[PDB]
Amino acid sequence: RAHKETLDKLTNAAINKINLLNTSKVKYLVSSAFAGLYVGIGILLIFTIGGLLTDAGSPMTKIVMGLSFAIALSLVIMTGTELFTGNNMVMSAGMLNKGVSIKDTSKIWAYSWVGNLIGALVLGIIFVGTGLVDKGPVAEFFANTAASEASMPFTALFFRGILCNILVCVSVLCSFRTNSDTAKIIMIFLCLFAFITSGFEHSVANMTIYSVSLFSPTISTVTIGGAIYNLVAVTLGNIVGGALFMGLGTYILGKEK
Amino acid sequence: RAHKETLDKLTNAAINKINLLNTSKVKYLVSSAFAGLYVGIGILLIFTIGGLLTDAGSPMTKIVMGLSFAIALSLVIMTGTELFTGNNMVMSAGMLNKGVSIKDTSKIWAYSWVGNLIGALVLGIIFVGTGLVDKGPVAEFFANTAASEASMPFTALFFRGILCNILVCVSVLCSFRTNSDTAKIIMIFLCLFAFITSGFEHSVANMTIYSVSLFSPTISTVTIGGAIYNLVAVTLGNIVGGALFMGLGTYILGKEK
Amino acid sequence: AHKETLDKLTNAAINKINLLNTSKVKYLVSSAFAGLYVGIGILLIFTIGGLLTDAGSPMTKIVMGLSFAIALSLVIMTGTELFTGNNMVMSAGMLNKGVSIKDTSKIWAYSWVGNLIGALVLGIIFVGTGLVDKGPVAEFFANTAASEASMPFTALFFRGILCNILVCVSVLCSFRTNSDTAKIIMIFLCLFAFITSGFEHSVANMTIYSVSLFSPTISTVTIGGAIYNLVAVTLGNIVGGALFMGLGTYILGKEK
Amino acid sequence: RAHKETLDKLTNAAINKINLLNTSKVKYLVSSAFAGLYVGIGILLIFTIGGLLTDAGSPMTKIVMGLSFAIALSLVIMTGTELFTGNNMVMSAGMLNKGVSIKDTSKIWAYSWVGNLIGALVLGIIFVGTGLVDKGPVAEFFANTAASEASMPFTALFFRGILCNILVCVSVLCSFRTNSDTAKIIMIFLCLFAFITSGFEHSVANMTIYSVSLFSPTISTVTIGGAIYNLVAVTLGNIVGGALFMGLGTYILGKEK
Amino acid sequence: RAHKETLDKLTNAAINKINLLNTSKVKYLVSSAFAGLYVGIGILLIFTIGGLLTDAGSPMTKIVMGLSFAIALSLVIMTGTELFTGNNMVMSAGMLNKGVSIKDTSKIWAYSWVGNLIGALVLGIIFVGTGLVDKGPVAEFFANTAASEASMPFTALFFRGILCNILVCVSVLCSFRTNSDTAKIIMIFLCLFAFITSGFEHSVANMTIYSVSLFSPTISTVTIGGAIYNLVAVTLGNIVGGALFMGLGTYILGKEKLNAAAENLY
């Protein structure tokens, strides 16, 4: 228990985030684009695995996918880049602790979400260019997954987005509470294993699901309207999980009253 | 060997726990709610695994479940939050060592148990909201497990609770005896793998098994009366394991006499 | 750093006898914990053994070896007293004139009996869970306890030698590093090797026999068979830990 | 975030590389040959795995190959040797940051690529001498892979080269951002898993694919022309991924404006 | 870098080895016996695994064996004991760097090789005494492997020995280049996985394969002449990999060009 010091670090991180954005939109957006791309890389890997194992009829598909997703947030944390979903916890705890304003929070949320999407778009374009989703099990895995995501009821997506960002943000929280980089990566691995395999939903990961499916001329299951519907529901859920649960929660634990 | 140093750390932790509760019930209960939910997240994952592998008739089911439970206690330790089962050893050692009273101990046990339950209930509600236990093998795995859990004889549940909390508290004990966060997680991973795969029972984990079964309209196998029966039996077993083995044991090892 | 390592072994031996001389209760409680922690590893890998044997898997013994690390990891991380590690520590310390032959036999006897107490307590409580009432796990304990008790003395003895070379070398590694993670990894590798290769650990066997004798489910064991196995394996363990690891580390480290 | 410190570290590493080369072509080329060989060693392992599992008809082939390739970059990083693909990010960031010139960069690129190729040639010769690709599934895996790699469309290989070197360079970037050797190896393990299993292309790894295929008297439909074609397309993609994405991006993050 | 400091550590390690040997033949040979035994322990495990999975028809056999061999060199490195194959790189680098003589090197190589053999012999006898290779698939795996190893052409064995000791010595090299014991062990795990699964040959591991064959009554069919032939070809390959690739390689990386005080890199 060093909840107070932890809240101090979250607050200092929120302050530094808005300071960076005020200093340089380009640096901020570039950082955000990296993080979106790094998360998408995890999606490329586990959807390749999904295609390979689904084709085979394996019962381990979802387990292997969850075990293999760690790289997504590991890369974000180890490169120090800006991820929308972690910003839900960091900005809300900072705002509650009076380090940043509500306008700082919406600004960081908006720019990091958009920058993240830019990363996912760039990745999607390059991945299609590889020819790796022209035809076959990986293309089909993207196609079928994107369509099921776009047709899932709003309540289901919302609540899955809540549980997802509790796991993502708590993995970010762990990284603020240890000085061991290996422990950070292990905690990320566990949290991402839990969230992927349990069936929870990450807004930024989903950007790459849709970017690949939409840019691919051979994937014809989904549509931009579908992408928006899914992303809105999941983003809202992520926000509630990261800001209302983790942000508020860590403020309560840490605030010297 | 460092047994005295270890007892001194346990004693300090006990003192700090009761001081926290006395200072702020809200901070104490929020921490307890977090721990209950973090442990439940482990349940959500391994029961999803349960449902996936049982439906497939796999012999590795229980082994993969044990291997995948580590997140539950790893989150608790890395976030510094309040878990009832760990408090059995810490408060008992601290009490024997005259750092805290019997009343402090009973108070910490009651508040952390109830707070853990709040966390489990909240998690259950949100998990049911995902639509992930509407129907299918995961819902069925919850429903079948919850039914067999509340129909097991008291004595079997009690003894399963003892062995479970020897393992949970010894992994907490290890965390008091190393400065390496990675060693802490590895020891937690081993102990949780042992207790889940061997078939031991954790009261706080069971809260989430029962919260999901209670909230899901598709799960109609267990009853409030049965959940209560299981929880009492297992809580009592956990208490004997944590306080009478680990608490008393570590006091005996460390006390300068 | 062989000299420094021998000094650490010698200091550890001196601390063990000083502890036993100061408090039999503290010493036996530490030993009981260690016996119970090793036994917890057996409950886990025999559960695994029951599950996979039932499935006719070819990976049974490999998964069992990979999954046993907790046994010595707990002992090392809790600083508790394990008979088998004491075979190397006390012999190195005795050769190096930190402790006496009589101190060594005394530590060996107390830690062996303390470990046994931990195994018995564990066996009783595990039987109480109802988890070996019937089914593949109960059958795996019963069948393993039976085959262990019928193996020829010489086979058990040599298996005990190789087992304690591996257990004591993992303890030796723990004296040679300041990294707790490295300690656990080396323990994991050594227990993997010894379990999967089919070697025998006296203290682990105490839990095998405590479960088997406390479970009312019918086996072909008997107390005579259990004692037979424990004696043969204990003797092999002593040779592996004291004559190989203890003498060897003394030779490497002694400033002559 | 420590983006400025990181950019400074990249720049210092670029200055060190060109100073090394200017000091001794022998030392520089020997270092480069080692790295080419270390990478190639990863190829021998995973192609042996490819052969064994492909022969068996396993659906896990590409997954186990990805999991098993970590040694390639782990050796390079832990030995401090010169790898062409890593040099794409490092020299470009250092050049942008005015620590080295464009001429230095192209010189480092040329020497490290040729040096890496020398190490791949030596490895291939020696591996063929073992008799391990005289015949059988491993020999056939080399022969069929080499052939399919050489007949892939230019654009496909190019985009595959881009995504590969984003992953290789970001794992190198991680090594500059932590002091933990274990964390370095873990991130490398993750990045190499992702790039191999997803199907992306590494110029230096391909040098060993082709050295083995061409030196082995057991017959394929490859040819020197096919090898060069593949190596050029993939090298160009690696340069873009390493220099235009990672080099430029890390410069933008770290540059004080 | 840091090649110069790595060369210094190699050189100092070479100096300490010959000093130890000069000081006490008994200490040096006991250290070597330990290392031979520790490596052999890796063999007993992975040949047990070999027997289990071969009998079962698994295609994962050689992969699982490679994954499970890490203990062999991890024990050597974590106990600080004397392994012939590692000494190929260490003594050659230190020799090139003028810390030890050619005679020091040949001596360390001779004593460590024989010492390693002693440990493998002791291990083989004790392992046969367990009765674990009286009959069955593990017995057959040891026996079949021993026979096939003794009948492989010299050139194949030689080249396999080169690649193996590049891997073993590079893992020893990583251990000089880090202060993290866990990193040392991970690099050892990766290098041994690569060398075992790829099919490369280790002289000291082969000593235990043959010692188990020597003492197992359930047939040898192999021949002392055959074992010797295998051991010589693989030992020579190992020497080339460790000394000519790794030893000379690390000397070249590490030696500061001023000196010149004899010779000229360019």
Ligand SMILES: CCCCCCCCO[C@@H]1O[C@H](CO)[C@@H](O)[C@H](O)[C@H]1O
């Ligand atoms: C590639 C260019 C990306 C530009 C993304 C800009 C997104 C702006 O987003 C807006 O930012 C405002 C603060 O300026 C906030 O007040 C608004 O809530 C928010 O919608």
Ligand SMILES: CCCCCCCCO[C@@H]1O[C@H](CO)[C@@H](O)[C@H](O)[C@H]1O
């Ligand atoms: C949601 C509100 C939760 C409040 C839980 C308080 C329950 C207290 O419960 C009681 O606490 C006493 C000390 O105060 C102890 O002595 C008793 O053993 C315990 O039953």
Ligand SMILES: CCCCCCCCO[C@@H]1O[C@H](CO)[C@@H](O)[C@H](O)[C@H]1O
């Ligand atoms: C629970 C009670 C267990 C007590 C175990 C005591 C076993 C004593 O054991 C004996 O101790 C003597 C010194 O006291 C030594 O001289 C002997 O070598 C040793 O066998």
Ligand SMILES: CCCCCCCCO[C@@H]1O[C@H](CO)[C@@H](O)[C@H](O)[C@H]1O
């Ligand atoms: C034995 C191997 C020797 C390889 C030496 C390669 C020399 C490369 O030299 C470099 O080539 C670049 C393009 O290739 C040019 O842009 C540089 O001007 C030139 O210095």
